[PDB]
Amino acid sequence: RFGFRDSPFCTSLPRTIMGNDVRRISYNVFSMMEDIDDVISEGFILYDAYFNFSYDIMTTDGVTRLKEDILIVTDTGNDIKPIHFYIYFENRNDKKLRYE
């Protein structure tokens, strides 16, 4: 609806993707899994805690991206870094921005 480039907003988190169900992991269980690298190769949903997020909308066009890497792994457990979005509007015919 809003015309963002690679918009990060869903109307509701989809329980099925392309006919396949999506793994649902509690945050406390997510802090346990040693093999996060293998798991993250497919998607998953974290749903057991409050997730804060801030977003800045830029009028010009650009590649929508997060500010930092999603994951941070320590010896005590795994965690998700602060979530900040740089949301840009989209021109469909900009080949360079599509490639990036």
Binding site: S31, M32, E34, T76, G77
Partner: protein, 50 residues
């Protein structure tokens, strides 16, 4: 501890569980075994409680 669920009162006396953890991790390095798991870390680190 910083975790939400862990409401246990970790003691600060005696031989620190961190020193034991470092000793075991060095031992596992020599035998080429993987280091202690995330789940195994707080099993060892929470043995000292109030």
């Amino acid at each position: 501890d910083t975790s939400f669920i862990d409401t246990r009162k970790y003691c600060t006396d005696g031989l620190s569980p961190r020193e034991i953890q470092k000793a075991l991790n060095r031992q596992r390095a020599y035998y080429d075994r993987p280091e202690l798991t995330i789940s195994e870390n707080k099993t060892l680190l929470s043995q000292s409680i109030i």
